Amino acid sequence: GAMAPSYRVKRMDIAKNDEECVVNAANPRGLPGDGVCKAVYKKWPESFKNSATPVGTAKTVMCGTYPVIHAVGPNFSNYTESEGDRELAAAYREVAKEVTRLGVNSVAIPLLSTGVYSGGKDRLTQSLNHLFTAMDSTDADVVIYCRDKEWEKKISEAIQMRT
Ligand SMILES: [Cl-]
Ligand SMILES: [Cl-]
Numbered sequence: 001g002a003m004a005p006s007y008r009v010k011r012m013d014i015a016k017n018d019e020e021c022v023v024n025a026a027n028p029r030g031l032p033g034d035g036v037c038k039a040v041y042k043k044w045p046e047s048f049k050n051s052a053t054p055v056g057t058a059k060t061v062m063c064g065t066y067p068v069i070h071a072v073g074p075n076f077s078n079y080t081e082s083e084g085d086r087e088l089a090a091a092y093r094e095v096a097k098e099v100t101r102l103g104v105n106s107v108a109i110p111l112l113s114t115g116v117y118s119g120g121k122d123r124l125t126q127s128l129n130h131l132f133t134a135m136d137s138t139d140a141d142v143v144i145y146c147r148d149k150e151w152e153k154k155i156s157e158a159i160q161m162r163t
């Protein structure tokens with residue numbers, strides 16, 4: 001584990017991360033997809049061999065020795081707010097189990113269900129709070145990746161408020 005486990009946020013492409021493993025915002029079918037998923041497919045295509053997994057779960061596939069944890073958040077266009085909230089919390093709990101099993105000291109993670117699976121709603125606080133609920137009991141350094149300048153400021157404020 002990290003000596004003083006922390007949370008950080010960076011505004012840049014997660015495919016350029018400086019962590020020991022990455023979480024992909026995957027689709028259930030293991031397809032190249034869009035957004036984060038397409039960037040992950042271009043950087044670590046080998047990790048999409050048998051990466052299909054249900055909504056609410058995470059499945060890790062190695063690219064060489066680098067782990068790619070495919071975490072499938074719900075598409076809020078298809079799920080109700082209640083059931084989607086439950087599946088989003090579940091996907092993050094599965095990411096925490098995989099990060100612990102892998103023994104990594106750091107992990108790069110995007111906010112699940114905040115892009116094309118958001119159903120057109122701003123889900124920064126919802127998704128980030130479920131990330132904290134799952135990752136707080138782990139001792140890996142967590143680095144959250146985002147692309148919007150206002151989201152970077154809001155995620156940074158939420159991290160600092162708890163310290
Ligand atoms: Cl970039
Ligand atoms: Cl998304």
Ligand SMILES: [Cl-]
Nearest residue numbers: 146147148151
């Ligand atoms: Cl963003």
